[PDB]
Amino acid sequence: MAFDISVNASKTINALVYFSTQQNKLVIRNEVNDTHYTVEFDRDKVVDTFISYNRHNDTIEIRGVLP
Amino acid sequence: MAFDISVNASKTINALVYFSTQQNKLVIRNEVNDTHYTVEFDRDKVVDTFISYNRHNDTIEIRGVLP
Amino acid sequence: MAFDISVNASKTINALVYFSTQQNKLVIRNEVNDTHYTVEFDRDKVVDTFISYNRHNDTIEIRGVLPEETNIGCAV
Amino acid sequence: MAFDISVNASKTINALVYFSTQQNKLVIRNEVNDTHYTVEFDRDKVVDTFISYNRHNDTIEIRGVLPEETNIGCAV
Ligand SMILES: CCCCCCCCCCCCCC(=O)O
Ligand SMILES: CCCCCCCCCCCCCC(=O)O
């Protein structure tokens, strides 16, 4: 189980993280202008995320894995 | 385990689905211009996806869940 | 193997996706209005689709290309 | 509780996220260059962050706001 986001580095990623009691889920929401990408996980899952810059493609990347 | 994508409905979502032998993963890649959002799953997971239009916000939505 | 499907935008396209180790196939089961499509193709082959809203006829449209060796079932 | 962290863009920010049922807290463990931040806050509180590339000083920047009742640990 993994996810990956890549955006042009002129853009800003608005990342929100919370645990919702009503949903009983860990939420990671990523917004890039009018586009949103959300992933949701159970209350006891560990998500390891890596934020980086790719110089060759001029992109910001976020990769998430379940270790 | 769930994901959700929302994009302004003037945009087109390029969704690619494949199983990679080298990664041993089911891949769902969604590209919206220069932004990409990929989710990856194990070889025997079922992903139920729903593609819809939200008239109030003028957005295309894709929601995926593991049933 | 190009395809183009559409539904009125008040409705939802529902696609179930999985890789079946026993069939050794990627399987997509799609519900499109009153219609079911079962699509099966091989590992390391891609289904490449474009999902859009057609403002001219108020539809959700999916257009794309299937691998050469694809099996398709249709039922209503 | 505003924050602003940065690393040279040749490096990676590594954030581990989980909700600990026993502590009844959302926990984020971040590695930022030579530094570790442990951040803990309550359910139904949001950490709202903005991740960008700063072309002027070649850094990855994360700026954002933490909930009022947040615990922060820092180690090098
Ligand atoms: C998560 C997005 C999945 C997109 C699934 C697209 C597959 C649609 C196949 C429809 C094939 C219909 C063929 C026909 O028109 O007779
Ligand atoms: C998946 C994205 C997660 C983003 C995590 C942002 C949390 C960063 C907290 C850093 C707090 C540092 C406080 C300080 O500068 O002393």
Numbering used by the authors:
A (entry chain B), B (entry chain B): 1 to 67
C (entry chain A), D (entry chain A): 1 to 76
Study authors write:
The vaccinia virus protein A46 is one of a series of proteins preventing expression of host proteins that induce an anti-viral state. The A46 protein acts close to the plasma membrane by binding numerous TIR-domain containing adaptor proteins such as MyD88, MAL/TIRAP, TRAM and TRIF as well as TLR4 to prohibit further signal propagation. The VACV intracellular immunomodulators form a family of Bcl-2-like (B-cell lymphoma 2 like) proteins with low sequence identity but high structural similarity to the eukaryotic Bcl-2 protein family. Here, we report the crystal structure of the A46 N-terminal domain comprising residues 1 to 76 and demonstrate that this domain binds fatty acids.
A46(1–83) crystallized with two molecules in the asymmetric unit; electron density for a bound ligand, later identified as myristic acid, was found inside one of the molecules. The two A46 molecules comprise two β-sheets arranged head to head as an extended β-sandwich. A tetramer is formed over a crystallographic twofold axis continuing the β-sandwich with the second dimer rotated approximately 90° relative to the first. The A and B independent subunits show marked differences, with a Cα rmsd of 1.3 Å for the 45 common β-strand residues; the tetramer can be described as an A/B/B/A arrangement. Subunit A has 7 β-strands whereas subunit B presents only 6, lacking the most C-terminal one. No electron density is seen for either residues 77–83 in subunit A or 67–83 in subunit B, suggesting that these regions may constitute a flexible linker between N- and C-terminal domains in the full-length molecule. A striking feature of the external β1-β7 face of the A subunit is a partially hydrophobic tunnel, spanning the whole subunit A and reaching into subunit B. In the X-ray structure of A46(1–83), clear electron density for C14:0 myristic acid was found, with the hydrophobic tail buried in the cavity whereas the carboxyl group is open to the solvent. Tyr37 adopts a dual conformation in the two subunits, suggesting a gate-keeper role as it folds back in subunit A to make room for the myristic acid. An acceptable alternative hypothesis would be that the bound fatty acids induce asymmetry of the A46(1–83) dimer, as they block a polymerization interface equivalent to B/B and prevent binding of a second fatty acid copy in subunit B. In such manner, using the same primary sequence, a dimer of heterodimers is formed that allows utilization of different interfaces for distinct functions such as tetramerization (interface B with 6 β-strands only) or binding of cellular targets (interface A with 7 β-strands).
